[PDB]
Design a protein around this motif. Structure first.
Motif, mmCIF file in Angstrom:
data_model
loop_
_atom_site.group_PDB
_atom_site.id
_atom_site.type_symbol
_atom_site.label_atom_id
_atom_site.label_comp_id
_atom_site.label_asym_id
_atom_site.label_seq_id
_atom_site.Cartn_x
_atom_site.Cartn_y
_atom_site.Cartn_z
ATOM 1 N N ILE B 73 0.899 -1.137 0.000
ATOM 2 C CA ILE B 73 0.000 0.000 0.000
ATOM 3 C C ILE B 73 0.941 1.191 0.000
ATOM 4 C CG2 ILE B 73 -1.660 1.333 1.311
ATOM 5 C CD1 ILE B 73 -1.273 -2.385 2.019
ATOM 6 N N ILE B 74 1.240 1.707 -1.185
ATOM 7 C CA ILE B 74 2.156 2.831 -1.312
ATOM 8 C C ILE B 74 1.495 4.117 -1.811
ATOM 9 C CG2 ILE B 74 2.806 2.183 -3.644
ATOM 10 C CD1 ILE B 74 5.706 3.176 -2.848
ATOM 11 N N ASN B 75 2.004 5.253 -1.339
ATOM 12 C CA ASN B 75 1.498 6.577 -1.706
ATOM 13 C C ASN B 75 -0.020 6.695 -1.684
ATOM 14 O OD1 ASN B 75 3.853 5.833 -4.048
ATOM 15 N ND2 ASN B 75 4.282 7.564 -2.680
ATOM 16 N N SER B 76 -0.663 6.228 -0.620
ATOM 17 C CA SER B 76 -2.120 6.301 -0.564
ATOM 18 C C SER B 76 -2.702 7.021 0.652
ATOM 19 C CB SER B 76 -2.711 4.895 -0.651
ATOM 20 O OG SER B 76 -2.347 4.278 -1.871
ATOM 21 N N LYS B 77 -4.021 7.193 0.629
ATOM 22 C CA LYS B 77 -4.747 7.858 1.706
ATOM 23 C C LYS B 77 -6.029 7.090 2.016
ATOM 24 C CE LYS B 77 -1.948 11.334 1.735
ATOM 25 N NZ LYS B 77 -0.818 10.664 1.021
ATOM 26 N N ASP B 78 -6.206 6.737 3.284
ATOM 27 C CA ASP B 78 -7.383 6.011 3.748
ATOM 28 C C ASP B 78 -7.673 4.734 2.965
ATOM 29 O OD1 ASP B 78 -8.975 9.241 4.270
ATOM 30 O OD2 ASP B 78 -7.644 8.085 5.583
ATOM 31 N N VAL B 79 -6.768 3.769 3.095
ATOM 32 C CA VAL B 79 -6.904 2.482 2.423
ATOM 33 C C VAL B 79 -7.262 1.428 3.465
ATOM 34 C CG1 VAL B 79 -5.668 0.628 1.265
ATOM 35 C CG2 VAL B 79 -5.314 2.989 0.553
ATOM 36 N N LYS B 80 -8.165 0.529 3.096
ATOM 37 C CA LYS B 80 -8.606 -0.540 3.981
ATOM 38 C C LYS B 80 -8.303 -1.848 3.276
ATOM 39 C CE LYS B 80 -12.660 -3.120 4.801
ATOM 40 N NZ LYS B 80 -12.371 -3.772 3.492
ATOM 41 N N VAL B 81 -7.543 -2.713 3.937
ATOM 42 C CA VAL B 81 -7.166 -4.003 3.373
ATOM 43 C C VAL B 81 -7.638 -5.123 4.280
ATOM 44 C CG1 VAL B 81 -5.298 -5.216 2.242
ATOM 45 C CG2 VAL B 81 -5.036 -2.805 2.852
ATOM 46 N N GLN B 82 -8.135 -6.202 3.692
ATOM 47 C CA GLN B 82 -8.590 -7.324 4.491
ATOM 48 C C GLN B 82 -8.204 -8.651 3.865
ATOM 49 O OE1 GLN B 82 -12.805 -7.922 5.876
ATOM 50 N NE2 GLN B 82 -11.632 -9.519 6.940
ATOM 51 N N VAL B 83 -7.686 -9.544 4.700
ATOM 52 C CA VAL B 83 -7.283 -10.879 4.277
ATOM 53 C C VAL B 83 -8.324 -11.858 4.771
ATOM 54 C CG1 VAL B 83 -5.055 -11.958 3.875
ATOM 55 C CG2 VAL B 83 -5.287 -10.188 5.639
ATOM 56 N N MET B 84 -8.834 -12.707 3.892
ATOM 57 C CA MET B 84 -9.799 -13.703 4.328
ATOM 58 C C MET B 84 -8.955 -14.896 4.753
ATOM 59 S SD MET B 84 -12.498 -12.203 4.172
ATOM 60 C CE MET B 84 -13.481 -13.507 4.815
ATOM 61 N N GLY B 85 -7.901 -15.143 3.983
ATOM 62 C CA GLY B 85 -7.010 -16.251 4.258
ATOM 63 C C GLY B 85 -5.650 -15.883 4.831
ATOM 64 N N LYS B 86 -4.598 -16.102 4.046
ATOM 65 C CA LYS B 86 -3.232 -15.851 4.498
ATOM 66 C C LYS B 86 -2.366 -14.919 3.647
ATOM 67 C CE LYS B 86 -1.181 -19.307 6.573
ATOM 68 N NZ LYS B 86 -0.122 -19.814 7.486
ATOM 69 N N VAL B 87 -1.601 -14.065 4.324
ATOM 70 C CA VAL B 87 -0.681 -13.129 3.673
ATOM 71 C C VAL B 87 0.552 -12.980 4.560
ATOM 72 C CG1 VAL B 87 -1.644 -11.078 4.781
ATOM 73 C CG2 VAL B 87 -0.356 -10.862 2.653
ATOM 74 N N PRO B 88 1.746 -13.222 3.994
ATOM 75 C CA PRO B 88 3.007 -13.123 4.743
ATOM 76 C C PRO B 88 3.338 -11.733 5.263
ATOM 77 C CG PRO B 88 3.297 -14.272 2.654
ATOM 78 C CD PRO B 88 1.976 -13.581 2.589
ATOM 79 N N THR B 89 3.320 -10.753 4.371
ATOM 80 C CA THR B 89 3.642 -9.392 4.769
ATOM 81 C C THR B 89 2.791 -8.334 4.063
ATOM 82 O OG1 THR B 89 5.293 -7.998 3.611
ATOM 83 C CG2 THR B 89 5.863 -10.318 3.965
ATOM 84 N N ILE B 90 2.464 -7.286 4.810
ATOM 85 C CA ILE B 90 1.686 -6.168 4.304
ATOM 86 C C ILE B 90 2.582 -4.969 4.543
ATOM 87 C CG2 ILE B 90 -0.257 -4.648 4.795
ATOM 88 C CD1 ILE B 90 -1.948 -7.068 5.387
ATOM 89 N N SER B 91 3.052 -4.352 3.466
ATOM 90 C CA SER B 91 3.941 -3.210 3.587
ATOM 91 C C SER B 91 3.250 -1.897 3.293
ATOM 92 C CB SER B 91 5.133 -3.379 2.645
ATOM 93 O OG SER B 91 5.610 -2.123 2.197
ATOM 94 N N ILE B 92 3.298 -0.994 4.263
ATOM 95 C CA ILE B 92 2.686 0.316 4.121
ATOM 96 C C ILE B 92 3.792 1.354 3.958
ATOM 97 C CG2 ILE B 92 1.164 2.010 5.179
ATOM 98 C CD1 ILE B 92 0.212 -0.516 6.947
ATOM 99 N N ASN B 93 3.809 2.021 2.807
ATOM 100 C CA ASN B 93 4.816 3.032 2.507
ATOM 101 C C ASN B 93 4.204 4.335 2.002
ATOM 102 O OD1 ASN B 93 7.374 4.098 2.270
ATOM 103 N ND2 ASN B 93 7.748 3.227 0.233
ATOM 104 N N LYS B 94 4.683 5.452 2.545
ATOM 105 C CA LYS B 94 4.196 6.771 2.167
ATOM 106 C C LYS B 94 2.667 6.810 2.115
ATOM 107 C CE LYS B 94 7.919 6.845 -1.005
ATOM 108 N NZ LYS B 94 7.819 6.519 -2.457
#
Lengths: 157, 157
Positions: B73-94
């Protein structure tokens, strides 16, 4: 228009452009400085004042003697700060590119950072030289099953 | 013009505006998604793909199943993320304002952050509810006499 005048306790220096000899000779212990919208400027403040604030500056070079409280570098780009004497805390916020030059008497300075990048703390060494150390700008957070545990991803050159 | 089409391995969804039913039904394990310049949009990706990337989005609502690698999730504003299953890493930048909803199967997800603000990790609880935890955005750094030692200033509501 370029401003540089004491207005009460506040030393207002703003809108400076391509100047490099700015100096604030006089000074009172309860005063504060607010360097606003200054680009490619170089300012020096002589004496011990309460606090300084670099807000919205680009290519700004600051060097001061002593600060009783805090020195804030907010919303800026390529700012250089130097303490000849002592400063308790230097806070970098929403700033990209900042070099904090400490001194033998402020090695106990605390560097608070947030939403900032490219920060380096220069440490003095016997001989007018400085060693450079980058302050972390990225962090890894994990879930405990009880709480979040955050680690700092240490920066290297 | 609004785009939403697979282009090779890349699922391109960009320029979306005020849509909210976007869904990517099909899916291949080696594909990737690139959500670009989408505002006030809501997208859902069904199936396990390699990675997702939310770049330059405002008020974006994303929900996916599984990711093999990383969700950016890069260069964003008011983002909503949801995993139903599996995700190793969620990187938030700028990014300013991001809420990561995890699941019983990705509680081990790693949240990498940088130059970002207002981030929260929502932890699931028996009952379709979430607990909110704010991830740190400010840090205190100190000089050792040997190196810099960075501490995290924990966030509270």
């Amino acid at each position: 228009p370029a401003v540089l005048e004491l207005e009460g306790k506040k030393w207002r220096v703003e809108n400076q452009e391509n100047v490099s000899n700015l100096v604030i000779e006089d000074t009172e212990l309860k005063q504060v400085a607010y360097i606003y919208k200054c680009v490619n400027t170089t300012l020096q403040i002589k004496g011990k004042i309460n606090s300084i604030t670099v807000d919205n500056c680009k290519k700004l070079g600051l060097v001061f003697d002593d600060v009783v409280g805090i020195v804030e570098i907010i919303n800026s780009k390529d700012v250089k700060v130097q303490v000849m004497g002592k400063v308790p805390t230097i806070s970098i916020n929403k700033t990209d590119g900042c070099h904090a030059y400490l001194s033998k008497n402020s090695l106990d300075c605390e560097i608070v950072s947030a939403k900032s990048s490219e920060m380096n703390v220069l440490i003095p060494t016997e001989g007018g030289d400085f060693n450079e150390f980058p302050v972390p700008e990225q962090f890894k957070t994990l879930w405990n099953g009880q709480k979040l545990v955050t680690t700092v991803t240490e920066i290297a050159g």
